[PDB]
Amino acid sequence: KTISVRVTTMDAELEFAIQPNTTGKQLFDQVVKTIGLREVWFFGLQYQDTKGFSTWLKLNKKVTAQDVRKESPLLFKFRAKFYPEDVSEELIQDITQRLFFLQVKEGILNDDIYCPPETAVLLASYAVQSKYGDFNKEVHKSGYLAGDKLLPQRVLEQHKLNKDQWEERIQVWHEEHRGMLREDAVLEYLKIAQDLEMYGVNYFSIKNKKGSELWLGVDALGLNIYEQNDRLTPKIGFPWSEIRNISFNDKKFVIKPIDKKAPDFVFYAPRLRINKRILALCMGNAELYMRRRKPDTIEVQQMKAQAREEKHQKQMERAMLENEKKKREMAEKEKE
């Protein structure tokens, strides 16, 4: 019979009925056609397996054949598994940018991605411009941001400041953003966020030959070896340009160099399950490193034209809606 399923993007609940033969590819394809996403290479479908682990659904296999729970409907969360090297030069669509913004903002607010307090204030101002739009003294009274989770909890519990003083700080920058489109505010958030040291870094706990505990960061640029305490600053770094090959077997991982007059890098991770995820993320981040170098697609080009013209059509439908709003606001003035 048909198996019900739910997909939640950062801002949408979705319902599908899937046959027992449906593959992750066929499911994912109905998800992206529904929301209009074409920049599909960054994204995946995440779920909780039969051991409560968050896992990425594989698209070359049947959904029901994967370690999915005895739940009806089956739950999936549509998320980004890969990140761009530059948001402004790679996130074409509004749906792509919006989905990234929400997901990264979630990481920041949660403290998963470290964010200095002064940077969080600027970030929250762009998030406020995205949600509210241009600051108005007539509509944004003292207390307008009390209802919003705006800063990371390490920021709030480090500094004396209460909801009032913190709002005062953000509102200065919200005022400063007067004139910005909400979609450009979204893009400005992403441009500051992506410069965070932990941004778009998948960490894993590893050990070197000697047995000392370390962090492995897998990202769009390469692999990095961090210390047990400092996961902000890597100690050793391998760009995807110097990596010739990545493999693992019975906990031992070996990264082979491009320059064969250079040694191998050996590191050790303990779970088969995570090791498969390290390898898959390695494989995908290296495929994307190269694509980003080989010149732009005669599909990407057509989508960039599509998203650019749709942007001028948004700023024509919103231009005609502003003229009606400005006429109705002036008419409703002489009432009291």
Curated annotation (Swiss-Prot):
FERM domain sequence ranges: 1-293
**Modification type N6-succinyllysine: residues:** K81
Q: Name one GO cellular component term.
A: extracellular exosome
Q: In which tissues is it expressed?
A: In all tissues and cultured cells studied.
Its Gene Ontology biological processes?
cellular response to testosterone stimulus; establishment of endothelial barrier; establishment of epithelial cell apical/basal polarity; gland morphogenesis; immunological synapse formation; leukocyte cell-cell adhesion; leukocyte migration; membrane to membrane docking
Point out residues bearing the modification Phosphoserine: S72
The record gives the membrane topology as: Peripheral membrane protein
Q: Does the keyword Membrane apply?
A: yes
Positions carrying Phosphotyrosine are Y114
Q: Where is this region: Disordered?
A: 321-336
Q: Where is this motif: [IL]-x-C-x-x-[DE] motif?
A: 113-118
A GO molecular function annotation here is: cell adhesion molecule binding
Sites bearing N6-acetyllysine, chain numbering: K77, K137, K163
Q: Where on the chain is S-nitrosocysteine found, per UniProt?
A: C115
Q: Which domain of life is it from?
A: Eukaryota
Q: How is its activity regulated?
A: A head-to-tail association, of the N-terminal and C-terminal halves results in a closed conformation (inactive form) which is incapable of actin or membrane-binding.
List locations, semicolon-separated: Cell membrane; Cytoplasm, Cytoskeleton; Apical cell membrane; Cell projection, Microvillus membrane
Subunit comment: In resting T-cells, part of a PAG1-NHERF1-MSN complex which is disrupted upon TCR activation. Interacts with NHERF1. Interacts with PPP1R16B. Interacts with SELPLG and SYK; these interactions mediate the activation of SYK by SELPLG. Interacts with PDPN (via cytoplasmic domain); this interaction activates RHOA and promotes epithelial-mesenchymal transition. Interacts with SPN/CD43 cytoplasmic tail. Interacts with CD44. Interacts with ICAM2. Interacts with ICAM3 (via C-terminus). Interacts with PDZD8. Interacts with F-actin. Interacts with CD46. Interacts with PTPN6.
Q: What does this protein do?
A: Ezrin-radixin-moesin (ERM) family protein that connects the actin cytoskeleton to the plasma membrane and thereby regulates the structure and function of specific domains of the cell cortex. Tethers actin filaments by oscillating between a resting and an activated state providing transient interactions between moesin and the actin cytoskeleton. Once phosphorylated on its C-terminal threonine, moesin is activated leading to interaction with F-actin and cytoskeletal rearrangement.
Q: What disease has this protein been linked to?
A: Immunodeficiency 50: A primary immunodeficiency disorder characterized by onset of recurrent bacterial or varicella zoster virus infections in early childhood, profound lymphopenia, hypogammaglobulinemia, fluctuating monocytopenia and neutropenia, and a poor immune response to vaccine antigens.
Print the domain comment field.
Answer: The [IL]-x-C-x-x-[DE] motif is a proposed target motif for cysteine S-nitrosylation mediated by the iNOS-S100A8/A9 transnitrosylase complex.
- The name of this protein is Moesin
Which species is this UniProt entry from? Homo sapiens (Human)
Which lineage ranks, top first, belong to the organism behind this chain? Eukaryota, Metazoa, Chordata, Craniata, Vertebrata
Q: Which residues of the full protein are shown?
A: 3 to 338 of 577
